Specification:
The structure is a homotetramer.
Chain A (H helix, E strand, L loop, with lengths): L9 H32 L7 H14 L17 E7 L6 E12 L5 E3 L8 E4 L6 E4 L6 E5 L5 E17 L8 E11 L5 H4 L8 E3 L12 E3 L1 H7 L4 E5 L10 E5 L5 E5 L6
Helix pairs in contact in A: 1-2
The complex binds calcium ion (CA) (4 copies).
The site of one calcium ion has 4 residues of chain B, from strand 2.
Chain A binds four DNA strands through strand 2.
PDB class: hydrolase/dna
Keywords: Type IIF restriction endonuclease, protein-DNA complex, hydrolase-DNA complex
Assembly: octameric
Chain lengths: 269, 267, 269, 267
DNA sequence: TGGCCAACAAGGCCT
DNA sequence: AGGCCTTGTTGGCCA
DNA sequence: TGGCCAACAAGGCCT
DNA sequence: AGGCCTTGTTGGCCA
């Protein structure tokens, strides 16, 4: 087995992102009943609330499903972060889990700051027909100081929890409606050749910034294009009138390379 | 992916025990410096103190390296136990980690109560020449109640932490030579590890049949390692450092047994 | 406020033992449903089981109600132990929580090893009319190394959880019966003058050892004599057919010095 | 003993806030060395970085000093929040700890959104000479559902952690001068701390009425301390040590204000 | 002190 | 899909 | 290796 | 209340 993620093959690397994602989906799933309650019944006190509700929900859902902590912390704009050891058959991997919460009325695409972009991006602006570029803002790994040698890189794993909702706002004891919780796993920089080799091959899109107003410049990631490149990298926990919790559905891909969905069991916790 | 370990192939099931063992070895390695202090400098109370030393060290070292806890406890004759989810490429697997501690002046073998036995054992007694048998005492899995359906089996994973020390009588009361860590295979793997009385790492118990004592069993380090090198690990102490030597035993991509040194953190 | 428990007055010292005990009673209370289940439905596999069931129940019940941990650990025969900071109005007190689990078919008295005795004991053997003595085996405190000075004593607080049960043994899916869970708070050594000034003033009794057989010698603590000396130092969580959990009853003493009992609310947890 | 904080006298209620504050000061004190490193050496991303630095430091320092957790969360506009039981001589009190972080180049005062305001405020504007008013945004308690009866109110306890720093431009990007810690009284204590517009530690907000901005409020350190010395604490950094100076402000048995140094651990 | 703005997220909408 | 412009959060600043 | 005992808890019972 | 004696746990030891 390995300790240095760089010695892992690309396939094995995607594998650890997959199990990282899977773990997080169970957390959100098992926390979905309380999440809907919190997301919908919390007083708005004049807009802005959803951004903070999304972050808190995510944190409460995930902090409960963490692993073997590493005594290392850092401050930054990323909502939820933890340096930890991730057990796996590839080896006990040091890891910096990074997940960002988003609240949106749109059930497709997500906006990213350059500080959240895992790998260098490039695509063609459908309107300007030109090639757009953006360097990754998330480091490939955080160096940890071993007690018997030199540094040991803790792999960075990027995740996005996207709360798709609708504003109903104040009515009875419910100020909004949580419709679905999408979870995204963005491929590590080492996987660029596989997911973004050329501007016409990618899941990126035009940023939500206003270039006319001379704004900082961001980037977008489109759900459908991510799911096509790799089905499991896009998960969806949807709410319906059949249950207080979301529908426990996990999207994966056969060993035969076809897309598949299955329902999984979850506990009350 | 899977949630039911029974759906996994035997090779995959072994990978979960192996990764469970690797996590534990890091924990004890990183806790080795303190383990040494507690084991060697803690005054003896009524002798047989190494017993509690071994159990306590094991808990402090491991309670710090757990994973996604499940709201269900396991009570019984096993030093350390936690029900939890184990992230894995084969799926997020529900698991019951069972680790038992042993203090011993011996460097080989280990003794087990039937309640710590993972699989139905069978071996040939060396002096009696007869076949000895023992039914497993550890359940293959603990059934958990899902919120949306029937039961979900949480795989049981057996691990043993063995403290090899020698009495000594400096401000120390004894010497911890090394900490061995054993991963015993699940019942599903019986045909791979103990298919018949002449192929097994088991051996006669430490009980006294003459005195009519219950009946216990043993696991021999050499045979366990020979059956699968990664299932027997060792963290040895040398005057080189205050921590054990960070060594992990495994095998090549060519099947060759290799012991590699690994990096560890202060804690 | 204080950091050194020795600077606390006797009254304040008893007060911290009281809040330590109170916290523990809630834990056991809220864990009583699962405790009964575990205690009664766990296969016996030939005797001895109850001693281990009592310890595990206690641990699961209490580890969940701990406070501000201190980075200090020690090995010893005491079942449950934790060095921690105990917030209180007297000050943020460093503390070594010590609790011992017992399983018994008797609903009165408890046996103690000298290693569990909090203060020096002395009483008169009702049969030999002689005076019995036993030095305390639990240290008054554990010295902790501060980072900006010398040592800081972490007060020792002794607690006993006594599982009063009856052997039914194997029948349907129940091997025994948990009747009540008693929780005892033994006064710190500093309180000797108050609880054991003379051999005819104490809650101690003849040990469970056999002097004829030349056994090591132990000591007993009698419930009724402890409750009389101080009502709150003896609590009782009893099970009845009215609820799966024990009856949430807390015993205390008025400011007027009279004994009182009240029922308290508890959560599912 | 009590479970309902409303049954407590005002002096007792203050003792719970005070002990809550003392625990937090130790946490930040023991985390001060690392806080200094994170605050001063973390590269600035788009400026306004001290904001996240202050929030994150506060969480790492405090998430390590919690008590008996209650299975109920609080979501909203408050940096750090945990519902829990607080051991106390007045009883095991259910509590909702609410602590908000602030980064600032100023050493006095603090700004608060209405949602972080613990009691209905009222003061006299110094330039307008008129009376300003603001209803509390923080609930007095969060009702919890008991397993055997009705509701149980979990007291809300307001704390603010203020990072006093100055821009600087060595391998450092700025300097953390000190960390102030504030304990704002519960609504029940209004008559003691803000009975009328001329007796209060509140002051005009930082919002812009001209621009028609919502309306915020301020708390002034000097008036808070003068009203009750222990409610304003300070952990200052000096070139003496890498940790802040472990000082706790309180008052005699004679009512005299005394600042004592206290012992702290490595962590 | 008060209180006007500056700097930034985070997104809602509307082509 | 693009991207313009609205809102709300947090304190730096300065009369 | 086998396997006989030693050293100790932890308590059940029986006056 | 006392306290004798039963059981079960854990490994030290040695043929
Ligand atoms: Ca975000
Ligand atoms: Ca053991
Ligand atoms: Ca015990
Ligand atoms: Ca804040």
């Amino acid at each position: 087995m390995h300790q240095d993620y760089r010695e892992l093959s690309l396939d094995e690397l995607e594998s650890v992102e997959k199990q990282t994602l899977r773990t997080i989906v169970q957390a959100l799933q098992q926390y979905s009943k309380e999440a809907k309650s919190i997301f919908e019944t919390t007083a708005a006190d004049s807009s802005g609330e959803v951004i903070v509700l999304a972050e808190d929900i995510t944190q409460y859902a995930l902090e409960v499903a963490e692993t073997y902590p590493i005594n290392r912390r850092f401050a930054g704009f990323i909502d939820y972060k933890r340096v930890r050891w991730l057990p796996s058959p590839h080896g006990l991997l040091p890891q910096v889990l990074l997940v960002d919460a988003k609240a949106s009325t749109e059930k497709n695409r997500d906006t990213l700051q350059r500080s959240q972009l895992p790998m260098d991006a490039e695509f063609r602006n459908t309107s300007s027909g030109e090639v757009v570029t953006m360097e990754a803002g998330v480091i490939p790994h955080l160096m940890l100081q071993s007690a018997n040698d030199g540094v040991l890189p803790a792999v960075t794993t990027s995740i996005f929890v996207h709360f798709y909702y609708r504003e109903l706002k104040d009515v009875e004891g419910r100020y909004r409606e949580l419709k679905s919780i999408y979870v995204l796993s963005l491929p590590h920089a080492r996987l660029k050749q596989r997911y973004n080799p050329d501007p016409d091959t990618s899941f990126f899109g035009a940023g939500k910034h206003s270039p006319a107003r001379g704004e900082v410049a961001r980037i977008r990631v489109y759900f459908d294009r991510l799911k096509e490149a790799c089905p499991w990298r896009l998960q969806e926990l949807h709410y319906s009138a059949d249950s207080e919790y979301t529908q426990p559905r996990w999207r994966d891909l056969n060993d035969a390379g076809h897309e598949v969905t299955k329902e999984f069991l979850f506990l009350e916790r």
